[PDB]
Every structure is written in structure tokens, then in C-alpha cells.
Design a binder for this molecule. Structure first.
Ligand SMILES: Nc1ncnc2c1ncn2[C@@H]1O[C@H](CSCC[C@H](N)C(=O)O)[C@@H](O)[C@H]1O
Length: 327
DNA sequence: CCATGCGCTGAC
DNA sequence: GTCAGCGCATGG
């Protein structure tokens, strides 16, 4: 993460829904806000959250009464995506996991916070010919909010990863906010090779298979794009190998292949997948965050997560607007 | 629960 | 024709 000297959100309160590792909390806390409620149902995720922040998040949101939730200023939610991703089937609103937005809508109707900050995958902006995005937009206008949405790629904000996502921000109409804007892009000066750990700390992650079909040469100069070097098996998901001189591919939660959930990379002559700490780093987490002791569950958590740096520049821009109240 | 071979869809 | 995805399905 980045350091913030000007703390634009000092007296505001917010809630962490679909908490996961607490990516939204780290970001909003560095700007000065305070957390008064958190929710998440996975046994193991609750263990890490507690290890780092000190509290246990409430369970299943579908059976919690919206009237018991504390008063607050900003609502945060990175809702589920299996039903909208380009890698899965595409059932959408007909999916048992695709109805979560309506619970946000339900909680929003009672507490009426000032800001709503949500995140989901790129294909959500294009799913069902745009009907899904419109249902979200119109439901939001009906509740008396304005709707701003956009797709930002992480390689444009300082992190070496090709993770594309849609961020949605909405302000209550009494406020009359007319100057909100998404952060501007800038040049990348850090690459995958600058986040890696020493060779000794790994060894056990190396893979020597006899399918290595080198199909390109190692490049000699850095570049902000994924550069493919070879294939294993049939070159399907998890059997593709990349150069440590470009950027990482999107980390995932339920992925497969011999180089599962992280992909494979050519390092000092050998091919291997990434370590949980290198996963923390390509996602913007600080070395002081404690990861779960089960490596298998650690990989699933970083893959469902959110990149801190981008949430930080966006949050700062929410506060600037709330603070511009001239006579 | 953990490991790993797959096969289709979207935006060039 | 090329290439990538906060995934799905099946075995122990
Ligand atoms: N019915 C439900 N009630 C409560 N939590 C739920 C839920 N369905 C899914 N979840 C949780 O929703 C999360 C979606 S992914 C969100 C990740 C988070 N932004 C990050 O910083 O890590 C998962 O952790 C999932 O376990």
C-alpha cells in the first residue's frame, strides 16, 4: 500500500460487508475513517480477519435484520462474482449466488448512508447486453442516489498485475456533489521481478515437467504487459508460463492446472508458481499482514480479494468532494 | 478438505 | 486466426 499524509475522512463511519481479508478496511482506515460493523460467513476467512483486526464478523447476511445494523456514513461491498465472470457459466440473477445485490439494496433503504462504494468483475458491465448494469443503475436512482461507474486496470496505478474491474460509487441526492472524478493513470516502474523472494525460501514450489514447449524467448527489457514464454499440457488455464520481466496475470479463487491460482513463471532457470507472500505483494498488501497458516486457503483468499492501491486513490477522491462546502 | 485436467466465451 | 479469465467437475 501507499502512505497517505492528508487524511480526508477523519470523522466518518463505515461498514465492511462481504469482508474477506479486509481489503476495504485497510484502504478506508489509512484515510482516517472508523469501522463499526463487519460481516462474512466463511469459517477460515473469519480466522484471518480476527488475527489482523481483533474482532469476529457476523454471519450470513441473508438472515440479518437490516434494522439492527449501526448508523454509518459509507457502505462498502465487493459482492460475489462467480455468476457474472467470463470464466464461469453465466446464469446471473437466476443463480443462487447471484442475488446478493438485492440485500445491499434492502439495507440501503433503511439506513440511508451518504456513500455506497461497490466492486465487481469487468464482464459485469457487459453481461446480458448491459441489462444487469442498468438494473443496478435504475434501482439506485429509485432509492434517490446518483450513479458513477467505471472499469480501471491495475497496471495503470502502480501494481504489476493485469486485474480489470468495475468500481461503482453513489452519493445521496441532498448533498449535490458535482465534482467527483476517477483517479488519473500513470507510468509503471515496478515489475514482477522486484517483488520475488530469495531462491532458498522456496525450492518446494518448483516444478520440472517434460511438457515444456518453449514458444518464445525471454525478453531483455521490462514492459507493462503479460509476456508468454511456454506451455505445458494443452496450454489451458494453469498450464501457461510467463516472463518475470512483464506483469502478473489475474489471481483466482477456485482455479486449476498444475500452476493453480497464480500461474507459472520462469525464475533463474526454473519454472514455479507464486508463494502466498508474493501473492500479498502483487495485491498491494504490506509485509506486516499475517496470512492464514493453511496455504490452500491463503490462495483462495488472495484470489477473491481487492488491490489496495486503487481503492486508496478512489477513497481519497470521495473525501475531497464531501469536504468542498463553500459559501 | 486438497490436487489438477478441462473447454468455452469475450474482445480483438 | 490469436489469447486470457475474483470458474467448474471429478478423483481420492
Ligand atoms: N450469504 C453470504 N453471507 C455473508 N457473506 C457471504 C455470503 N456469500 C458470500 N459471502 C462472502 O462474500 C465474499 C466475496 S469476495 C470479497 C473479498 C473482499 N473484498 C476482500 O477484500 O477480500 C467471500 O469472502 C464470501 O465468503
Amino acid at each position: 500500500m501507499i502512505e497517505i499524509k492528508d487524511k480526508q475522512l477523519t470523522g466518518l463511519r463505515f461498514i465492511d460487508l462481504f469482508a474477506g481479508l479486509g481489503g476495504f478496511r485497510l484502504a478506508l482506515e489509512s484515510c482516517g475513517a472508523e469501522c463499526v460493523y463487519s460481516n462474512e460467513w466463511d469459517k477460515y476467512a473469519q480466522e484471518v480477519y480476527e488475527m489482523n483486526f481483533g474482532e469476529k464478523p457476523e454471519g450470513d447476511i441473508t438472515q440479518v435484520n437490516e434494522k439492527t445494523i449501526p448508523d454509518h456514513d459509507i457502505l462498502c461491498a465487493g459482492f460475489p462474482c462467480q455468476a457474472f465472470s467470463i470464466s464461469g457459466k453465466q446464469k446471473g440473477f437466476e443463480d443462487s449466488r447471484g442475488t446478493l445485490f438485492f440485500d445491499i439494496a434492502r439495507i440501503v433503504r433503511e439506513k440511508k448512508p451518504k456513500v455506497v462504494f461497490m466492486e465487481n468483475v469487468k464482464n459485469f458491465a457487459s453481461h446480458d447486453n448491459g441489462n444487469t448494469l442498468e438494473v443496478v443503475k435504475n434501482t439506485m436512482n429509485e432509492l434517490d442516489y446518483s450513479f458513477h461507474a467505471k472499469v480501471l486496470n491495475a497496471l495503470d496505478y502502480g501494481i504489476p498485475q493485469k486485474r480489470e474491474r468495475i468500481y461503482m460509487i453513489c452519493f445521496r441526492n441532498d448533498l449535490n456533489i458535482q465534482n467527483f472524478q476517477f483517479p488519473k493513470p500513470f507510468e509503471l516502474n515496478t515489475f514482477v521481478k522486484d517483488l520475488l523472494l530469495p531462491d532458498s525460501e522456496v525450492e518446494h514450489l518448483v516444478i520440472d515437467r517434460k511438457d515444456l514447449v518453449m514458444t518464445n524467448q525471454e525478453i531483455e527489457q521490462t514492459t507493462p504487459k503479460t509476456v508468454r514464454l511456454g506451455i505445458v499440457g494443452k496450454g489451458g488455464q494453469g498450464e501457461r508460463i510467463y516472463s518475470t520481466r512483464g506483469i502478473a496475470i489475474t489471481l483466482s479463487a477456485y482455479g486449476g492446472g498444475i500452476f493453480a491460482k497464480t500461474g507459472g513463471y520462469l525464475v533463474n532457470g526454473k519454472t514455479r508458481k507464486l508463494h502466498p507472500r508474493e501473492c500479498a505483494r502483487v495485491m498491494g498488501y504490506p509485509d506486516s499482514y499475517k496470512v492464514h497458516p493453511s496455504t490452500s486457503q491463503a490462495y483462495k483468499q488472495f484470489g477473491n480479494s481487492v488491490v489496495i492501491n486503487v481503492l486508496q486513490y478512489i477513497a481519497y477522491n470521495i473525501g475531497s468532494s464531501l469536504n468542498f462546502k463553500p459559501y
